[PDB]
Design a protein around this motif. Structure first.
Motif, PDB file in Angstrom:
ATOM      1  N   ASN B  44       0.726  -1.165  -0.005  1.00 48.48           N
ATOM      2  CA  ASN B  44       0.002   0.073   0.055  1.00 48.48           C
ATOM      3  C   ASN B  44       0.835   1.235  -0.033  1.00 48.48           C
ATOM      4  N   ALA B  45       1.901   0.997   0.644  1.00 48.27           N
ATOM      5  CA  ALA B  45       2.770   2.418   0.893  1.00 48.27           C
ATOM      6  C   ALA B  45       3.419   2.771  -0.455  1.00 48.27           C
ATOM      7  N   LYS B  46       4.173   2.050  -1.107  1.00 48.80           N
ATOM      8  CA  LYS B  46       4.575   2.030  -2.390  1.00 48.80           C
ATOM      9  C   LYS B  46       3.609   2.314  -3.286  1.00 48.80           C
ATOM     10  N   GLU B  47       2.493   1.838  -3.629  1.00 50.79           N
ATOM     11  CA  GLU B  47       1.345   2.366  -4.343  1.00 50.79           C
ATOM     12  C   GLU B  47       0.926   3.730  -4.475  1.00 50.79           C
ATOM     13  N   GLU B  49       2.857   6.261  -2.928  1.00 52.90           N
ATOM     14  CA  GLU B  49       3.794   6.771  -3.040  1.00 52.90           C
ATOM     15  C   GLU B  49       3.951   7.112  -4.669  1.00 52.90           C
ATOM     16  N   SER B  50       4.111   6.158  -5.334  1.00 51.16           N
ATOM     17  CA  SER B  50       4.136   6.044  -6.690  1.00 51.16           C
ATOM     18  C   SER B  50       2.985   6.985  -7.361  1.00 51.16           C
ATOM     19  N   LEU B  51       1.780   6.665  -6.671  1.00 51.15           N
ATOM     20  CA  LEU B  51       0.629   7.642  -7.252  1.00 51.15           C
ATOM     21  C   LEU B  51       0.615   9.103  -7.435  1.00 51.15           C
ATOM     22  N   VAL B  52       1.012   9.617  -5.909  1.00 49.75           N
ATOM     23  CA  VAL B  52       1.083  10.959  -5.887  1.00 49.75           C
ATOM     24  C   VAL B  52       2.200  11.530  -6.387  1.00 49.75           C
ATOM     25  N   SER B  53       3.497  10.601  -6.596  1.00 48.50           N
ATOM     26  CA  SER B  53       4.691  11.244  -7.101  1.00 48.50           C
ATOM     27  C   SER B  53       4.395  11.469  -8.986  1.00 48.50           C
TER      28      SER B  53
END
Lengths: 62, 58
Positions: B44-47, B49-53
């Motif tokens: 969930n954290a990586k998802e 992170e990648s989404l908002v970046s």
């Protein structure tokens, strides 16, 4: 004189007065052991909780 | 112990204490629950992170 008389009389005719260790035991708290070593229960064991949590709170961060 | 003059019980409770000296044994119970938790969390954290970046550069 009288000192000697008392000293002699006292010491000789009874040094200590009776005492019993067994009787003492009743009047004092006895050692008793802690019960159970205990093991902490496995908190939130496995992904049963996780699958539940992901679904339960799919809540986003706004 | 040198205080007590009736000492034949200090040797007893000393030996009882040293007997039950591993009063409670070791626990690491967070090693199955911590790793499982870490997987769901990490995913969930990586998802996120990648989404908002991604959105930032868009």
């Amino acid at each position: 004189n009288v000192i000697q008389d008392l000293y002699l009389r006292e010491l000789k005719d009874t040094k200590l007065a009776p005492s019993t260790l067994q009787d003492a035991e009743g009047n004092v708290k006895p050692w008793n052991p802690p019960q159970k070593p205990n093991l902490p229960e496995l908190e939130l064991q496995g992904p049963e909780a996780l699958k539940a949590y992901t679904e339960q709170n799919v809540e986003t961060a706004h | 112990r040198s205080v007590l003059k009736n000492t034949s019980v200090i040797d007893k409770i000393e030996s009882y204490v040293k007997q039950y000296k591993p009063v409670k044994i070791d626990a690491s119970k967070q090693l199955q629950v911590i790793e499982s938790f870490e997987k769901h969390a990490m995913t969930n954290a990586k998802e996120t992170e990648s989404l908002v970046s991604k959105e930032l550069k868009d």
